[PDB]
Design an enzyme around this catalytic site. Structure first.
Site, PDB file in Angstrom:
ATOM      1  N   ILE A  24       0.792  -1.174  -0.218  1.00 48.55           N
ATOM      2  CA  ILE A  24       0.120  -0.139  -0.032  1.00 48.55           C
ATOM      3  C   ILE A  24       0.842   1.201  -0.058  1.00 48.55           C
ATOM      4  O   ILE A  24       1.667   1.461   0.870  1.00 48.55           O
ATOM      5  CB  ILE A  24      -0.905   0.131   1.193  1.00 48.55           C
ATOM      6  CG1 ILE A  24      -1.507  -1.302   1.537  1.00 48.55           C
ATOM      7  CG2 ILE A  24      -1.810   1.249   1.000  1.00 48.55           C
ATOM      8  CD1 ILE A  24      -2.419  -1.921   0.441  1.00 48.55           C
ATOM      9  N   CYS A  25       0.429   2.189  -1.009  1.00 43.79           N
ATOM     10  CA  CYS A  25       0.952   3.576  -0.804  1.00 43.79           C
ATOM     11  C   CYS A  25      -0.232   4.430  -0.103  1.00 43.79           C
ATOM     12  O   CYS A  25      -1.240   4.880  -0.839  1.00 43.79           O
ATOM     13  CB  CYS A  25       1.338   4.114  -2.222  1.00 43.79           C
ATOM     14  SG  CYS A  25       2.271   5.732  -2.022  1.00 43.79           S
ATOM     15  N   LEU A  26       0.040   4.725   1.163  1.00 43.49           N
ATOM     16  CA  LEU A  26      -0.817   5.568   2.068  1.00 43.49           C
ATOM     17  C   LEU A  26       0.002   6.257   2.951  1.00 43.49           C
ATOM     18  O   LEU A  26       0.776   5.569   3.490  1.00 43.49           O
ATOM     19  CB  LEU A  26      -1.739   4.769   2.523  1.00 43.49           C
ATOM     20  CG  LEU A  26      -2.858   5.681   3.336  1.00 43.49           C
ATOM     21  CD1 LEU A  26      -3.612   6.592   2.457  1.00 43.49           C
ATOM     22  CD2 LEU A  26      -3.971   4.600   3.914  1.00 43.49           C
TER      23      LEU A  26
END
Lengths: 199, 76
Positions: free
Chosen positions: A91-93
């Protein structure tokens, strides 16, 4: 684990069990081990998104340093989204990187993930091919996402045009997931997808 | 032996072949009934591109087997 981490987890775990969200059947978290190091989360695809009707399993790992470091989260269930890896579930968060705050909880992370599904940020992509399709061809993106949601996350809706291209390739003896990956990557171009399958 | 080859727009063709036949030679049968140079042919069976020089026996290609033909897409 450290007492601080243990108490936070148990407390957070009971926040989720008793939330409005579990009762509405959208967020969920379960234990894996008895140490509390690993959790399995689940999130329902948000309404009025291509992920709608789907359920996504999440691998959650609590670090020794919780809560001063964020949990490590990865999507177990495959998903077609700009900020998540279509291959690894990464995830890119921001909250999972340098915007973690100690006050955040398991419930807030899950809700935040749901929010990301509803609102992608293609200019801070995890999966470049997906992000491009998102920007270049939005309807193609919607359909592709809905297809993955159906194939992997149990989402109901289906695309007949994409399904038959999938069988035509699987007919050649190709692995089915490989086929879905190839067609999705190549914008449903059978010739280009094929070349990828042969490579 | 009877077998089928399906092309891009879907046409299905047929060949009469020998199990012993090499891939090079199936492609020759292809060039004639269809005209494609072997240099431009890729034959696929069971998810695998077939190398010339092995045999139909080598790939377990049996009667009524369909093979898939995908042409080599220029490039440079």
């Amino acid at each position: 684990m450290a007492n601080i981490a243990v108490q936070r987890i148990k407390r957070e775990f009971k926040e989720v069990l008793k939330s409005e969200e579990t009762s509405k059947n959208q967020i969920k978290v379960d234990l894996v081990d008895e140490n509390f190091t690993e959790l399995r989360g689940e999130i329902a695809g948000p309404p009025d998104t291509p992920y709608e009707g789907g359920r996504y399993q999440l691998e959650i790992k609590i670090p020794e340093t919780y809560p001063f470091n964020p949990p490590k989260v990865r999507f177990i269930t495959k998903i077609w989204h700009p900020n998540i890896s279509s291959v690894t579930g990464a995830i890119c968060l921001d909250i999972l990187k340098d915007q973690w705050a100690a006050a955040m909880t398991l419930r807030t992370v899950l809700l935040s993930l749901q929010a990301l599904l509803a609102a992608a940020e293609p200019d801070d992509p995890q999966d470049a091919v997906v992000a491009n399709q998102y920007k270049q061809n939005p309807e193609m993106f919607k359909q592709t996402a809905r297809l993955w949601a159906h194939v992997y996350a149990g989402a109901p809706v289906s695309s007949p045009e994409y399904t038959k291209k999938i069988e035509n390739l699987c007919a050649m003896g190709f692995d089915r997931n490989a086929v879905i990956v190839a067609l999705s990557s190549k914008s449903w171009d059978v010739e280009t997808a094929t070349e990828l399958l042969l490579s | 032996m009877q077998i089928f080859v399906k092309t891009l727009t879907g046409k299905t063709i047929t060949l009469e072949v020998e199990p012993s036949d090499t891939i090079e030679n199936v492609k020759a049968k292809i060039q004639d009934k269809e005209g494609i140079p072997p240099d431009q042919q890729r034959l696929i069976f069971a998810g695998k591109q077939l190398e010339d020089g092995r045999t139909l026996s080598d790939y377990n290609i049996q009667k009524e087997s369909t093979l898939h033909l995908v042409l080599r897409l220029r490039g440079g």
